[PDB]
Amino acid sequence: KTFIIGISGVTNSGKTTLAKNLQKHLPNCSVISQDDFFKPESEIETDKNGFLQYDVLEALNMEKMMSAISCWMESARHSVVIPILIIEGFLLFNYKPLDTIWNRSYFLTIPYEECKRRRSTRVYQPPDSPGYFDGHVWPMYLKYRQEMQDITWEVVYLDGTKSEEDLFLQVYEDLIQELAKQ
Numbered sequence: 001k002t003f004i005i006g007i008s009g010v011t012n013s014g015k016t017t018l019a020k021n022l023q024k025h026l027p028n029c030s031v032i033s034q035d036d037f038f039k040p041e042s043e044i045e046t047d048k049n050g051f052l053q054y055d056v057l058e059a060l061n062m063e064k065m066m067s068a069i070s071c072w073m074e075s076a077r078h079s080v081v082i083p084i085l086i087i088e089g090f091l092l093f094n095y096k097p098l099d100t101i102w103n104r105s106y107f108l109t110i111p112y113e114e115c116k117r118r119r120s121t122r123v124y125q126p127p128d129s130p131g132y133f134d135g136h137v138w139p140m141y142l143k144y145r146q147e148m149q150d151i152t153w154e155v156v157y158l159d160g161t162k163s164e165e166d167l168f169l170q171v172y173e174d175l176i177q178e179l180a181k182q
């Protein structure tokens, strides 16, 4: 009845833009962004070096996100008199409760050098502290990729250095084939 797409990947790799571009070309499609479920700074912990622990599941209210997904599911049942949900976020594929929800999974990748450069041009709240990328972001990303070594479902890895349109066309082409097989 429904088709759920997961778009994860390294930080600042065009995940939200890809989700939005796909949505504009798919009927009855909604998007849920993991970034909307981060806990407030006051609830974030710090490591031995004083770095805020934002790049781990503990920094997110995943129970609240599951509730949001369940709400979409209920809405989807009344949207037709196929409903598509795209869930996008940097830490989705290591969350066990959702391991069986994915009908198709995409993962945006960008090498260390370029990822660091792009991250610096972006402003977060709170802003990245000095040395935050090498001290927390990248190490946690590597931990995430390590956890994914034992992933239990198929993931399509994407080159995040490709253009917005290139990525959209690539994923759309794949998605329509998957929808057809359903």
Ligand SMILES: NC(=O)c1ccc[n+]([C@@H]2O[C@H](COP(=O)(O)O)[C@@H](O)[C@H]2O)c1
Residues within 6 Å of the ligand: 010, 011, 012, 013, 015, 035, 038, 054, 055, 089, 090, 124, 125, 126, 137
């Ligand atoms: N959303 C917030 O309120 C918030 C606050 C501080 C740091 N961050 C950063 O956002 C990143 C993930 O979001 P993106 O995948 O969009 O870059 C994480 O790597 C994290 O370090 C987000």
